[PDB]
Design a protein around this ligand. Structure first.
Ligand SMILES: O=C(N[C@H]1[C@H](Oc2ccc(F)c(F)c2)O[C@H](CO)[C@@H](O)[C@@H]1O)C(F)F
Length: 630
């Protein structure tokens, strides 16, 4: 069961889903839950909300919590009783996971979430989620009892700079309208956010335009709203004016419409490190208390701790609404972040108004963290990092679960980055790895372990590429899967170099250099975004072991045979601190000879620049970056 319920009593007896049933309360229960029931489908089945005729017999069993439910299955009768309509739907989501092979376990469940708002903020920089991916997201939220979707992609020009003042065009508006309908069907609050701050004026004209935009969104069906003031400079960062604007939205709009739910703001000082030592106490004191204030923790990317959440709560005078910056990867775009969700304290549910997760631009790939966050935020006390990661992967790709686990286990670290934020990766093999190298610079078992791992990586790569159960997932990860397969091939060849004769070693060597060039070409042709282009994989443990083992066994060959083989581990056609090639930049990692003559563009230097005006260039002699026409 995911999320695991607050309370559960299992009897050890089984019951056939009744071939013949009597439905009580289907005309009065939450239509969204009734629809799920009738699809899954004499024995009495009672569905309803506390107060309904159908479930009055169980009124004492129903948890007195928002979104709570009582679920019961026995030989005699089935009860599916929400404390409110969402609760009934959540009872159904649990019910569907009990139903296996046409059979049900005899169980009594009393359930409710520990955190009031739980979900995803699409708030990353980069390519926003497609329409299809958002639709699929919303269904997945409902299955996993996430009730919050904060729409806020940084690069949607109608969400942020400069066209936040304009209504969405017809096509986009028709799409959002559908998203809102689908969200409603899955018991998700669609929260449309706006990000006006970089150029907002504190006047009537901009105040009114912002309210007019919210009204347009409201006409599209939107019933929750957010205003983000993060990552901005200038007058838009003034706390009094922020609070005043939010209170004005609250009082003229959120409390005037009959049916507005969440009103949320993201502060400019949204993590402890970025907070000056009185912006936050001004917000805490001036902002209407029903208004939510977001917070990403001690740092832009951090895990939430008891000390950290108590620090925020005291300044803002309400429980912080957490924006958790994982698995967002818009600052490490060359990595996928498919590891487990961990690091957040599991005893601080009462200290938070909400918990949402900023995910990767890769929507399906994000379902691993998302499913885990859902589990954490509903039942933090029973949150099991590893089992939930395994369950996520198995729900997302039942046909190739083991292969996805293999891929995901070696694609979880961010690599070095400006935020200093890291994740564990490849922990199972790390001991055999680190002992194999030390000895080299070995136990047979460690060698076979590495060998087993490479073999497995290839099996996983090839089965994943060809999987048809979740095609959109496979499209997202495909470039990394190719790179992952290459890595495992390079690993097998390097191990063969460690093991017979001069001639066989040179065959393996030459095959390695070819594999290095293949990885380079995948890195230059896939995922060519402006910020961190290319495709890295297995970066924490595996690639480093392979490269170092390669440097080492070559060194020993040159010593033994008086040879002069090149020991370089990453292919690089240009010559010169490694050179890098990023799009049409050739740069010295913070005399260069290129592999051919190109038209030059510019040379940028920091210890400065010169335009080259398309002059032909092969040699550059003196950041340190050459930009060519390519
Ligand atoms: O996290 C937030 N905002 C952005 C914030 O973005 C930054 C933008 C500029 C920075 F200099 C910086 F250090 C972080 O961090 C996330 C990760 O990159 C982004 O995805 C978010 O859109 C929000 F809580 F304020």
């Amino acid at each position: 069961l995911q999320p695991p319920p607050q309370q559960l009593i299992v009897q050890n007896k089984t019951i056939d889903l009744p071939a013949v049933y009597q439905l009580n309360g289907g005309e009065e229960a939450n239509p969204h839950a009734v629809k799920v029931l009738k699809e899954l489908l004499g024995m009495l089945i009672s569905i309803g909300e506390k107060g309904d005729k159908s479930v009055r017999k169980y009124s004492r069993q129903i948890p007195d919590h928002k979104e709570g439910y009582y679920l019961s299955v026995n030989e005699k009768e089935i009860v599916l009783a929400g404390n409110d309509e969402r609760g009934t739907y959540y009872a159904l989501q649990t019910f569907a996971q009990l139903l296996k092979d046409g059979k049900l376990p005899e169980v009594e469940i009393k359930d409710y979430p520990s955190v009031r708002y739980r979900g995803v903020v699409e708030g990353f920089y980069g390519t926003p989620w497609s329409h299809q991916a958002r639709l699929s997201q919303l269904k997945f939220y409902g299955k996993n009892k996430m009730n919050t979707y904060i729409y806020g992609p940084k690069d949607d020009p109608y969400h942020s700079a400069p066209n936040w003042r304009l209504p969405y065009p017809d096509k986009e508006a028709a799409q959002l309208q559908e998203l809102v309908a689908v969200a409603n069907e899955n018991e998700v609050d669609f929260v449309w956010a706006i990000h006006p701050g970089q150029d907002i004026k504190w006047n009537k004209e901009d105040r009114d335009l912002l309210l007019a935009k919210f009204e347009k969104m409201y006409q599209l069906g939107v019933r929750s709203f957010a205003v983000f003031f993060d990552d901005i400079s200038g007058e838009g960062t003034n706390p009094q004016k922020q609070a005043e604007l939010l209170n004005y939205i609250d009082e003229k709009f959120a409390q005037v419409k009959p049916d507005i739910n969440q009103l949320v703001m993201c502060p400019t000082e949204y993590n402890k490190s970025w907070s000056n030592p009185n912006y936050l106490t001004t917000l805490g004191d001036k902002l209407n208390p029903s208004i939510q204030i977001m917070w990403t923790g001690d740092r832009v990317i951090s895990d939430i701790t008891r000390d950290g959440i108590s620090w925020i709560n005291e300044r803002i005078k309400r429980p912080a609404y957490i924006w958790w910056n994982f698995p967002v990867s818009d600052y490490v775009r060359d990595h996928l972040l498919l590891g487990p969700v961990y690091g957040n304290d599991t005893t601080i549910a009462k200290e938070m108004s909400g918990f949402v997760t900023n995910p990767m631009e890769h929507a399906e790939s994000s379902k691993i963290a998302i499913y885990s966050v859902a589990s954490y935020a509903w039942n933090p006390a029973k949150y099991d990092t590893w089992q939930t990661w395994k369950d996520a992967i198995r729900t997302i790709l039942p046909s190739a679960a083991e292969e996805l686990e293999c891929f995901a286990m070696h694609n979880s670290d961010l690599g070095p980055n400006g935020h200093g934020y890291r994740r564990e990766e490849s922990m199972d093999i790390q001991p055999a790895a680190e002992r194999f190298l030390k000895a080299f610079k070995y136990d047979k078992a460690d060698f076979e372990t590495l060998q087993y791992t490479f073999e497995r990586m290839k099996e996983s790569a090839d089965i994943l590429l060809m999987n048809t159960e979740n095609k959109p997932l496979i499209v997202e990860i495909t470039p990394w899967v190719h790179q992952f397969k290459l890595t495992a091939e390079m690993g097998e060849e390097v191990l063969k170099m460690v093991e017979r004769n001069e001639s066989y070693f040179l065959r393996k060597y030459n095959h390695v250099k070819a594999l290095q060039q293949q990885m380079f070409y995948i890195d230059q042709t896939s995922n060519q975004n402006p910020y961190q282009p290319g495709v890295k994989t297995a970066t924490r443990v595996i690639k480093p072991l392979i490269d170092r083992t390669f440097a080492t066994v070559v060194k020993f060959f040159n010593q033994k045979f008086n040879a002069h083989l090149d020991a370089t581990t990453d292919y690089m056609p240009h010559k010169m601190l490694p050179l890098q090639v990023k799009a049409n930049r050739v740069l010295i990692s913070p005399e260069i000879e290129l592999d051919a003559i190109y038209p030059g563009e510019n040379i940028q230097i920091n210890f400065l620049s010169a335009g080259l005006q398309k002059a032909p260039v092969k040699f550059v002699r003196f950041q340190f970056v050459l930009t060519i026409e390519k």
